[PDB]
Amino acid sequence: EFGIFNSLWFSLGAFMQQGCDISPRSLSGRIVGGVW
Amino acid sequence: WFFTLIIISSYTANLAAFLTVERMSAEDLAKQTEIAYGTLEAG
């Protein structure tokens, strides 16, 4: 579900402390989410 | 979301300045005019 349009939405949502409708499940995705 | 992020930060920042500021003569009476000063008559 982490397509290019969804990934931009999650990254924007995370930066503004509003959360998102999806979260990463793989280790690689969670490492990116952690540092972002 | 961007409007919310700036406004909430502004409220917290201005409140911090508001709380910080309050935490921190005859010439003076003559220079100003907001306070009226008088004497006793025939004294």
Tell me the resolution in Å: 3.5
A12 and B1: CB-CB below 8 Å?
A: yes
Q: Give residues 1 to 36 of A whose Cβ lies within 8 Å of B.
A: 12-13, 16-18
Q: What angle do CA A13, A14, A15 make, to 5 degrees?
A: 95
Q: What element of type H or E holds B10?
A: helix B2-23
Specify burial of residue A10 (Cβ count, 10 A radius: 0-12, 13-18, 19+). buried
**Which tokens belong to B4?**
């919310």
Q: Which amino acid is at B40?
A: L
Experimental method: cryo-EM
CB A14 within 8 A of CB A20: yes
CA distance A13 to chain B (A): 8
Contacts of A17 in chain B (CB under 8 A): 5
CA–CA separation, A35 vs A20, rounded Å? 16
